[PDB]
PDB file of C-alpha atoms in Angstrom:
ATOM      1  CA  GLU A   5       0.000   0.000   0.000  1.00  0.00           C
ATOM      2  CA  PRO A   6       2.603   2.591  -1.152  1.00  0.00           C
ATOM      3  CA  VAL A   7       2.606   5.859  -3.011  1.00  0.00           C
ATOM      4  CA  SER A   8       2.374   6.609  -6.741  1.00  0.00           C
ATOM      5  CA  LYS A   9       3.296  10.291  -7.235  1.00  0.00           C
ATOM      6  CA  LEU A  10       2.277  11.518 -10.701  1.00  0.00           C
ATOM      7  CA  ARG A  11       2.931  14.833 -12.386  1.00  0.00           C
ATOM      8  CA  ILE A  12       0.860  15.485 -15.503  1.00  0.00           C
ATOM      9  CA  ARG A  13       2.012  18.321 -17.748  1.00  0.00           C
ATOM     10  CA  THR A  14      -0.895  20.103 -19.454  1.00  0.00           C
ATOM     11  CA  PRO A  15      -0.801  21.732 -22.932  1.00  0.00           C
ATOM     12  CA  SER A  16      -0.517  25.082 -21.108  1.00  0.00           C
ATOM     13  CA  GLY A  17       2.785  23.659 -19.829  1.00  0.00           C
ATOM     14  CA  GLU A  18       1.400  23.698 -16.299  1.00  0.00           C
ATOM     15  CA  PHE A  19       1.709  20.769 -13.859  1.00  0.00           C
ATOM     16  CA  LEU A  20      -1.225  18.770 -12.542  1.00  0.00           C
ATOM     17  CA  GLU A  21      -0.034  16.794  -9.511  1.00  0.00           C
ATOM     18  CA  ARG A  22      -1.273  14.146  -7.113  1.00  0.00           C
ATOM     19  CA  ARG A  23      -0.674  10.814  -5.418  1.00  0.00           C
ATOM     20  CA  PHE A  24      -2.501   7.502  -5.638  1.00  0.00           C
ATOM     21  CA  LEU A  25      -2.371   3.971  -4.276  1.00  0.00           C
ATOM     22  CA  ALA A  26       0.253   2.188  -6.318  1.00  0.00           C
ATOM     23  CA  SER A  27      -2.381  -0.498  -5.973  1.00  0.00           C
ATOM     24  CA  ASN A  28      -4.996   1.833  -7.545  1.00  0.00           C
ATOM     25  CA  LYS A  29      -6.552   0.854 -10.880  1.00  0.00           C
ATOM     26  CA  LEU A  30      -5.478   2.877 -13.929  1.00  0.00           C
ATOM     27  CA  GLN A  31      -8.991   4.177 -14.612  1.00  0.00           C
ATOM     28  CA  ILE A  32      -8.547   6.284 -11.488  1.00  0.00           C
ATOM     29  CA  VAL A  33      -5.795   8.312 -13.122  1.00  0.00           C
ATOM     30  CA  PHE A  34      -7.884   8.409 -16.271  1.00  0.00           C
ATOM     31  CA  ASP A  35     -10.669  10.013 -14.238  1.00  0.00           C
ATOM     32  CA  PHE A  36      -8.399  12.390 -12.372  1.00  0.00           C
ATOM     33  CA  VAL A  37      -7.124  13.989 -15.596  1.00  0.00           C
ATOM     34  CA  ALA A  38     -10.564  13.854 -17.159  1.00  0.00           C
ATOM     35  CA  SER A  39     -12.072  15.690 -14.179  1.00  0.00           C
ATOM     36  CA  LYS A  40      -9.381  18.352 -14.563  1.00  0.00           C
ATOM     37  CA  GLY A  41     -10.760  18.813 -18.101  1.00  0.00           C
ATOM     38  CA  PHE A  42      -8.571  16.453 -20.099  1.00  0.00           C
ATOM     39  CA  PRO A  43     -10.832  13.738 -21.697  1.00  0.00           C
ATOM     40  CA  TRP A  44      -9.520  10.405 -23.119  1.00  0.00           C
ATOM     41  CA  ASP A  45     -11.052  10.568 -26.611  1.00  0.00           C
ATOM     42  CA  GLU A  46      -9.340  13.949 -26.919  1.00  0.00           C
ATOM     43  CA  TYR A  47      -5.940  13.483 -25.166  1.00  0.00           C
ATOM     44  CA  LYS A  48      -3.022  11.097 -25.242  1.00  0.00           C
ATOM     45  CA  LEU A  49      -1.628  10.458 -21.756  1.00  0.00           C
ATOM     46  CA  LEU A  50       2.046  10.049 -22.448  1.00  0.00           C
ATOM     47  CA  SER A  51       4.751   8.363 -20.473  1.00  0.00           C
ATOM     48  CA  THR A  52       8.303   9.115 -21.469  1.00  0.00           C
ATOM     49  CA  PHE A  53      10.244   5.850 -21.271  1.00  0.00           C
ATOM     50  CA  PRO A  54       9.016   3.416 -22.004  1.00  0.00           C
ATOM     51  CA  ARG A  55       7.122   5.738 -24.328  1.00  0.00           C
ATOM     52  CA  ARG A  56       3.496   4.682 -24.061  1.00  0.00           C
ATOM     53  CA  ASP A  57       0.137   6.451 -24.319  1.00  0.00           C
ATOM     54  CA  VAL A  58      -1.067   5.429 -20.920  1.00  0.00           C
ATOM     55  CA  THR A  59      -4.671   6.021 -22.005  1.00  0.00           C
ATOM     56  CA  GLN A  60      -4.061   3.153 -24.409  1.00  0.00           C
ATOM     57  CA  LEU A  61      -3.219   0.859 -21.481  1.00  0.00           C
ATOM     58  CA  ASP A  62      -5.918  -1.387 -19.907  1.00  0.00           C
ATOM     59  CA  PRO A  63      -7.754   0.695 -17.234  1.00  0.00           C
ATOM     60  CA  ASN A  64      -7.955  -2.289 -14.916  1.00  0.00           C
ATOM     61  CA  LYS A  65      -4.200  -2.676 -14.412  1.00  0.00           C
ATOM     62  CA  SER A  66      -2.493  -1.060 -11.446  1.00  0.00           C
ATOM     63  CA  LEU A  67      -0.086   1.882 -11.531  1.00  0.00           C
ATOM     64  CA  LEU A  68       2.381  -0.631 -10.173  1.00  0.00           C
ATOM     65  CA  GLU A  69       1.639  -3.090 -12.983  1.00  0.00           C
ATOM     66  CA  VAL A  70       2.357  -0.286 -15.451  1.00  0.00           C
ATOM     67  CA  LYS A  71       5.683   0.983 -14.030  1.00  0.00           C
ATOM     68  CA  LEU A  72       3.860   4.098 -12.885  1.00  0.00           C
ATOM     69  CA  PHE A  73       5.619   4.180  -9.529  1.00  0.00           C
ATOM     70  CA  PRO A  74       6.959   5.898  -7.676  1.00  0.00           C
ATOM     71  CA  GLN A  75       7.901   9.217  -9.295  1.00  0.00           C
ATOM     72  CA  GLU A  76       6.817   9.760 -12.884  1.00  0.00           C
ATOM     73  CA  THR A  77       6.067  12.785 -15.017  1.00  0.00           C
ATOM     74  CA  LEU A  78       3.419  12.288 -17.709  1.00  0.00           C
ATOM     75  CA  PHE A  79       2.301  14.268 -20.719  1.00  0.00           C
ATOM     76  CA  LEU A  80      -1.080  15.155 -22.078  1.00  0.00           C
ATOM     77  CA  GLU A  81      -1.324  15.756 -25.795  1.00  0.00           C
ATOM     78  CA  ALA A  82      -4.185  16.140 -28.261  1.00  0.00           C
ATOM     79  CA  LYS A  83      -5.356  12.932 -29.943  1.00  0.00           C
ATOM     80  CA  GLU A  84      -7.216  15.840 -31.698  1.00  0.00           C
TER      81      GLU A  84
END
């Protein structure tokens, strides 16, 4: 029960920030960024290394299961 600390950079270049259960399902993060106004159908959620569009990952997996732990910076970007 330890701490995933994510920093999402917005298109404005500003930094969304918050912590989750590393045991927390991925959909949770999906919702967090969505609630802050950044919807899946419209935005790629990018991890640098290994470069993956996290949105494209199965929402059921854990942040632990997806190497999102314990100190990542992510990137939102228009799927247009």
